[PDB]
Amino acid sequence: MEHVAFGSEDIENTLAKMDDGQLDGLAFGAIQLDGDGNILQYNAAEGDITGRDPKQVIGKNFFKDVAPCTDSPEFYGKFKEGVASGNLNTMFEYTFDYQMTPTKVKVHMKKALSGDSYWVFVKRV
Ligand SMILES: *C(=O)/C=C\c1ccc(O)cc1
Numbered sequence: 001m002e003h004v005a006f007g008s009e010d011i012e013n014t015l016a017k018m019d020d021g022q023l024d025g026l027a028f029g030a031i032q033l034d035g036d037g038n039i040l041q042y043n044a045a046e047g048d049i050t051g052r053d054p055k056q057v058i059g060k061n062f063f064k065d066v067a068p069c070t071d072s073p074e075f076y077g078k079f080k081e082g083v084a085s086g087n088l089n090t091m092f093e094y095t096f097d098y099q100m101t102p103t104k105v106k107v108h109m110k111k112a113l114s115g116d117s118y119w120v121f122v123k124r125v
Helices: 011-017 044-050 062-066 076-085
Strands: 029-034 039-042 089-096 103-111 117-124
Touching (some): 011 103, 011 117, 029 044, 044 117, 076 103
Antiparallel strands (some): 029 039, 089 103
């Protein structure tokens, strides 16, 4: 396992060194989005959480296609406020209920080290 803790204050530095193969080693789910909500990386442990297979969701829009539960002021609203501000660091609980058994999760959204990319981290609660 790659040793990184969910909610780590420097998680965006640690993950900056990580390819898709190492993202899959994470103890929690991890999705990289660009400013428009497009999935750039999506890890296996999120796959286990949501049941989505990863190679298939890369390049789809998270807010519009993949995850519609998140299209609301409480998820997507925050994400968009953050994109436009150029800074994002928020944690909250949420339920995923699209085409799946309702699963409660802790979400952490953080701006990445690189310019126009954002992390979504996810873990069971
Ligand atoms: C709720 O948002 C529904 C589904 C879903 C699918 C994949 C991921 O990563 C999160 C949520």
